[PDB]
Amino acid sequence: NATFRDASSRRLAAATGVALAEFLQQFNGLAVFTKNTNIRTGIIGTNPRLMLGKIRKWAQDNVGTLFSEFDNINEDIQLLTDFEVQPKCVGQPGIFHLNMRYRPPVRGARINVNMAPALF
Amino acid sequence: GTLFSEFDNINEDIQLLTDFEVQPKCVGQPGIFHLNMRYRPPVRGARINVNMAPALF
Amino acid sequence: DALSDGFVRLCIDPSLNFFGEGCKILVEGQMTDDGSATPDAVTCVTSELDIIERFGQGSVLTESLRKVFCTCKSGVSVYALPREDASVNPTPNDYATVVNECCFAVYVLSSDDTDWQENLRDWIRSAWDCSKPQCFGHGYVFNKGTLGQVLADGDNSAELSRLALPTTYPVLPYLTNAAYGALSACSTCNNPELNIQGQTFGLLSCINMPESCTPGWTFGEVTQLQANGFVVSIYNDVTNYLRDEKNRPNATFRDASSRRLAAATGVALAEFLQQFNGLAVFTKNTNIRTGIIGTNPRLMLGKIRKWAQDNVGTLFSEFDNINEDIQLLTDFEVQPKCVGQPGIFHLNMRYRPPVRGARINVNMAPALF
Amino acid sequence: GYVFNKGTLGQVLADGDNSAELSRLALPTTYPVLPYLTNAAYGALSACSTCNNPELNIQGQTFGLLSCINMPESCTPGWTFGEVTQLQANGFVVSGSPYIYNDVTNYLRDEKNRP
Amino acid sequence: CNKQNGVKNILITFTDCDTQEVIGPISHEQPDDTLPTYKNCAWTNTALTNGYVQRSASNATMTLPVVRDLRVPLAFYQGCAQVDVQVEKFDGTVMTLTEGAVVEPEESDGRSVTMNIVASEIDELLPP
Amino acid sequence: CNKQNGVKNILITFTDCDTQEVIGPISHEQPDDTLPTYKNCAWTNTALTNGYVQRSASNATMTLPVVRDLRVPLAFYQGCAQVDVQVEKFDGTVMTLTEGAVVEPEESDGRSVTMNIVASEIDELLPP
Amino acid sequence: CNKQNGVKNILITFTDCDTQEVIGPISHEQPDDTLPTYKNCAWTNTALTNGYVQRSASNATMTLPVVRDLRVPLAFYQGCAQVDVQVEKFDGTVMTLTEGAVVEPEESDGRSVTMNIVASEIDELLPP
Amino acid sequence: CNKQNGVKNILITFTDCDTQEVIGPISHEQPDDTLPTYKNCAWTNTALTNGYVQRSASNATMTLPVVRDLRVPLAFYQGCAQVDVQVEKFDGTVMTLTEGAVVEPEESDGRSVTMNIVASEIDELLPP
Amino acid sequence: MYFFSVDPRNGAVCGSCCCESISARPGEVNGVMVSYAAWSAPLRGHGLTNKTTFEIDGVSVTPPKVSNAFGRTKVGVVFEGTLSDLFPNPEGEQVEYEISELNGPSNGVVELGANGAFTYTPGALFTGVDRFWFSINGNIGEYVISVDPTTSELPQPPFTTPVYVPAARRSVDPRTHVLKFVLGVSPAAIPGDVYRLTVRQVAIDCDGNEFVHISCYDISIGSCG
Amino acid sequence: MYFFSVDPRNGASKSGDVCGSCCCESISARPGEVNGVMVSYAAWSAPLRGHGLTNKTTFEIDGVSVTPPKVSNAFGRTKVGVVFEGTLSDLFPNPEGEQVEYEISELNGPSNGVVELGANGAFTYTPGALFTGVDRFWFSINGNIGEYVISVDPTTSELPQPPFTTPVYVPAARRSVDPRTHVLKFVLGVSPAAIPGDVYRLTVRQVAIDCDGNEFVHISCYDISIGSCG
């Protein structure tokens, strides 16, 4: 489980954590309609899918800088709303549960030459 | 949408409870048409608690 | 650090888990008392950390679940029934008490004793009975011995996939068995249509058998095993059926794919019919009023047919004579009316596994010019 | 209405009823500012902002940063995470310059059905 | 024989594609003597030259007039909800249409609507 | 049951779109036996192929014949005045409409007009 | 519900490339029955001889007709501000485009604009 | 039925030529009444003078409209994935094509795309 | 009044195993009717008989905290008793007692003293059994007193079980195949508990033979209705 | 009540022979129940224009899955009026005496007497005064159910022997045949000692009669499935 072996891995982990935070600061008290998902003309808001979209977009964008080339992205990103992961009648309106992988990028090592001075 | 959230059952919250029947023709005073409406402010954003799971290939 | 506010709440944990487990394979095998755990008690084991001092170091169960814990990386909910020890083979086991309604899809029994295998068979077939509570389980067992013995040491059970092995097989038998089951589960527990054969979809990862020239069952023996039953390796992931009530040819219940898809149709129709609860079903005037939610037996049959005409191709195949394959008879209809009671109905369908590909005989004949 | 309440958890936690008409800014016993100033600032900013548009949640750093407080930068807060999390269930207006967040009122319960 | 033509039962199930609510199956009553009209073959044909024909893909349509039930909103008949309809004639024939959609709504006065339903396929039972 | 079809009350409010002066709400009387028609769903459908359908946006319409009130100019019925209409049937139903706009004016004779109101949405109150 | 080809939500976020001000995300409404059209592949192809093809670099395009919101200036639609657009269909698909730029603006009347947006890449979500 | 012209089966196999992953063969459905068009001879001719002709090398061409399958991304239709296609008509003919490349991608709306496949050679199977 | 229908035994709510469901509130005494019409009508005979048998089993009991106590006083004479040696009050807790007026005595009056003392004055000219229900710090128990007609004594009755079916209040209607019986719930039943009632009803044919039938119902002691 | 329609033995088949048949009709039973079964030979005996059925039916009980019982049964004897004492500990051959809880379920208690269970595998059976016959009661040692019969003579010598009722049985004489409608009625009693999950097979051989007194034999089978809660 060398996932946290490289120091650089942990450092960039913290970095991408705070970056993901500053990205998901725009989704503040900005309204979210989770029962009709039909935003009326003029209103300013979103809904679970319209936010999952933006999250995946940000993920794709940052690939190469912090993340590596993602695996099947439809698995990594998930934006389960509050009353979908909680005891039925408990979930407070307006909470989400986003959860994501990283797969940090790859770098260079392990050069195993097999030189052969063989003759002519 | 802007002033409040979607009514779950609009034919229950709204109620125009009047009293006109009581008012007899032997007097003119109108105007008791009280109205009682429910309220659920538009839902907003709150804790979006995230759970990242680093890994490798 | 831009996280003080309280809006985002992040937990950077490497060993997270999101999957919806499902896929509830059970492993059964004798143990050594080193394992600090109550025997005869189903234990939904976690990954390795809670090991040999949970089931018994060294004993068959250790290696079995190690292979199982191996193979599939993610997708299953492993369950263990650590039976205890005592021409010895302490197998006695009529234990529908310890293992009960909590239902398991895949079963693997690491014991060549016919009795234990037959008991597991009986339990599965009981689960697979017309009894309204259903879960549709399937087992996997191994069987070594010579050709004569392997043939003799068998049955009609189609709820297992008894694995054949020659008396030369290097690897300890039960090992492979476990792996087999493991792979199947973790592979098919979402898509039932898949069939575990060939090389790409079915090669056992954790085996590493020593290569040789003399394989094992020669071609003739291979045909014997295949036709008769057993799943000689992998290839031919059928379930030994070979027969039926009276007439032998019953191609339908041959492939394991057929069985998994049949279980899928069963659970789908079960979870579908429940929209006919309440409802109110008129059966004398056959004339629902105006403004009352209700249905008529004919209407119900129509609904059922419509349903069975959408899943076709994906679950069923073609439904040759739809007018006869799907029949719904009310209690009063069949029974001459003395012992009739509104509420009871009889539905009977005709399962036909979607035809799959098979051998393609080639007859290339060269010539010149 | 906007008002403050200062002291130690116990008191501040027990110096507030289900009164929904007031926002009770909670202040630690070591709060190194004059309560009056901060309370006035909070109320004033809320008022000035919500004249044309009421929906705006005055919270977080960006909009809710009490401008004229110039608190002396330090390295230890008053209410720690625990006692905060505590009186966030209990409605209060905890302030961390210092910015405001969880701009709620001291409203927790209708006639008896608390939630 | 050919028992007298006519409808006997009309079951309709409404499903709103916004709130995911379900209503029904509610029965309805014919408003007049006109009968619901059907078309099962999901392939139209077009006349080419010399006996040939161009067979392309199409829908299964349905025309159904019913008196509005005073509990279901009128909008649910003008194409604001997915309908699941079932008819049964007197001679035993029963026709089922699932997850259909009201296409090209017409003006209605509030007591008798005429739905033009379109769906992928309609099933017939052919009484024994 | 289903008490007799027919209209009981018709209320109309005129607002001139130039001087913003409001008149009403005034009542009116049906000129004949016919009834107003309706369409509530703001999304018409179009028959695609193989059962599918294209759901586009559209307008809720309403066609209503009334007798001209001899104190309101005829121009206010011909589409020179924003109208708000309300209809109430015998069975208890009521249909309200706000910020309507008389579209496609039809030549009238001065005592009986047929207004084709178009509005964003018509609201019901299905009887108790 | 399934089988309904149409748009449900259109979000647009304007950012002025002069004052760095942000406006949105504001919802919009379709002006007619035409749908926004898309092209995701950022590589155009050209037909060479004998089955080959010259794969060159290109952009991700988008064509979007919307009703101008009477609060955002018209200039923001005619290619004077960076736009961030996000659409959702009825079948669950949602397409996101960030930091787009309106190319080749067309004449408008003030109530219905047709934006030809060009961007680096568009992502799809492929409903489950 | 030995006469009816039209398409009966359409199979498509996608292979994205970066990750080298294959999807299919997946079936498809025609979006309208129109039929795919073909051109098999990879040698176009150009009219010289006096009865002669210049015979140059070119591509086997194919034009095919289909409904996008909601499990394959739209990019795979816009030309970011090599395609292998097969069409089978009612009269028994089949046209297969391997290692195709979508050239000149056309703007689509997300449910009905028109692919211009170009390949080295198309094969027939003239009905017996 | 609960109303259940029996399965007519054709292999034609399984819940967990088979047994039906019955909600119940502590203190109530309700009535249940079960219609064997579906099972006994095809067997054309003489209907049911008055040979039902009931059995109560608890699958969730929550063993009681407080305990009960007996009493054998005489007629007309006052009785004194304590209420402190009942609750074992394991962890230091106020021993605040209470006598609910809903479940007080039946032919007397108690006088709750300051510290778990009570004075029971039986009704003049009365000899028999009496009960009352106390609540020691939320947990409810019963105290039974036997007032004796001054001759020698009076026997000991059994402390009532949380869920019970009265001794003789059952009936059968052979003209409609309906069994009526009563469900009594003690006020000491702890909410959340679940008991199981099993019934074995016998029908009879025109010759005097028997037809057995067995069923269950799961009684869920729930609070607040 | 179960009602079955017999096969006609003529040309085509019936009841799901679509893909063959389990070959036996099914009968769900619960330990302790005594139900009634009717079989209608109208499909087979009506074309045989004659005198219908006769009272010459014969049955056979065979177990295909038994799961032999844990606790054995026992037999007792006593004179009239004199109280009987007995033990309940030597009937449970066990690998451990862990917490053996001798229990007498009231639903299947005695019939003409009363039983007082002791503390440890003892019991006192007081037969009813002025009574002589056979009396049984079903005990449950650690969940495992068995029966104890204490048949009482009138102190003459003894009753010979009760037959130790089987898990599933058909009473000796409670069957009948109606030659007017071609229906055979018989009762099916299953003891409370049947184990859930067992499977027995009951085969019925019924003979009709022509107009002159000859015979037409017919044979059928039924699989009895003992399931608790049913």
TrEMBL record, chain B:
Coiled coil: none annotated. This is Tail sheath protein. It comes from Agrobacterium phage Milano. The lineage of its organism: Viruses, Duplodnaviria, Heunggongvirae, Uroviricota, Caudoviricetes. The chain holds residues 442 to 498 of 503 of the full protein.
From TrEMBL, chains E, F, G, H:
It comes from the Viruses. This is Virion-associated protein. It comes from Agrobacterium phage Milano.
TrEMBL record, chain I:
Transmembrane segments: none annotated. It comes from the Viruses. Coiled coil: none annotated. Disulfide bonds join C19-C216. This is Virion-associated protein. The lineage of its organism: Viruses, Duplodnaviria, Heunggongvirae, Uroviricota, Caudoviricetes. The chain holds residues 57 to 286 of 286 of the full protein.
Automatic annotation (TrEMBL), chain J:
Disulfide bonds join C24-C221. This is Virion-associated protein. It comes from Agrobacterium phage Milano. The lineage of its organism: Viruses, Duplodnaviria, Heunggongvirae, Uroviricota, Caudoviricetes. The chain holds residues 57 to 286 of 286 of the full protein.
